[PDB]
Amino acid sequence: ATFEIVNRCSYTVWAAASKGDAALDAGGRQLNSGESWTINVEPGTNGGKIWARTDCYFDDSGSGICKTGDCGGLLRCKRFGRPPTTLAEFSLNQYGKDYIDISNIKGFNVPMNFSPTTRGCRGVRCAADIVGQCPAKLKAPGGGCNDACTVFQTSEYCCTTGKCGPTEYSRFFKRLCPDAFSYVLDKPTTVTCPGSSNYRVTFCPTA
């Protein structure tokens, strides 16, 4: 499948793409405002993620540090990023269907739009001012709005027993971005698309 990754933010972001155990394509790249990066992901990819990182320094060997979404200090991510990160998640060619969603289970950093560029399904979006409204206990000094698991490490917020309910924190993310997963057991806002679809992810889709 082809993913085009479009930075519509006024600020530079460092896009990242991984399936946890490896890079997807180059794994990461700088995107200045308006730039687009087209990547190829292998059919059958299960548990792929896309996100933006903010405020990154990298040396000439591709080593450094971002304030949100850092993936062990590399430009080209092999691993998932440090929260807070708004996540585009996908599993492709799963019994003939692709499954997409946006998640705030690991917090929020940049607003996003994750849509098909082929026919047969709808996109999803989380484009509210979650950082501006974030609660002080979840505000990340680095930038962004953490999830309450990250911060408090309780069974309830992390859903460690497999039984958990929504919370004051999860409801905050849900109130602002109802189409994004707000906690691990939220009613699914997964979208099922035809197998082998192509997509666009747009950072700051409205500004």
Side-chain angles (χ1 to χ4, degrees), residues 113-171:
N113 189 95
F114 182 20
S115 286
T117 61
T118 56
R119 68 198 186 167
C121 49
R122 61 172 198 105
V124 280
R125 176 179 292 206
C126 173
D129 189 13
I130 296 198
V131 165
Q133 303 287 18
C134 188
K137 292 189 198 148
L138 297 191
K139 284 235 183 57
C145 188
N146 285 309
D147 66 293
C149 171
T150 309
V151 174
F152 291 98
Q153 296 276 101
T154 82
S155 299
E156 196 60 19
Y157 299 142
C158 304
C159 216
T160 304
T161 69
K163 323 290 172 133
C164 45
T167 64
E168 204 67 30
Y169 291 127
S170 75
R171 289 180 187 97

Side-chain angles (χ1 to χ4, degrees), residues 1-3 24 40-48 89-100 114 193-199:
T2 87
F3 286 73
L24 296 182
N40 183 70
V41 183
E42 247 225 304
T45 289
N46 170 80
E89 312 177 303
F90 38 94
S91 283
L92 312 177
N93 305 103
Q94 304 291 311
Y95 305 98
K97 298 302 196 177
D98 287 357
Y99 294 96
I100 71 167
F114 182 20
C193 289
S196 303
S197 300
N198 295 339
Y199 301 88

Side-chain angles (χ1 to χ4, degrees), residues 48-65:
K49 289 191 197 313
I50 285 156
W51 68 97
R53 296 163 296 173
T54 59
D55 270 81
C56 303
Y57 171 68
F58 295 109
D59 71 21
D60 296 273
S61 70
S63 187
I65 185 169

Side-chain angles (χ1 to χ4, degrees), residues 4-7 29-38 200:
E4 183 177 63
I5 301 157
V6 173
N7 185 14
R29 218 199 81 174
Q30 185 169 310
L31 296 170
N32 291 328
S33 180
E35 289 196 327
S36 303
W37 172 38
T38 303
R200 185 171 301 108

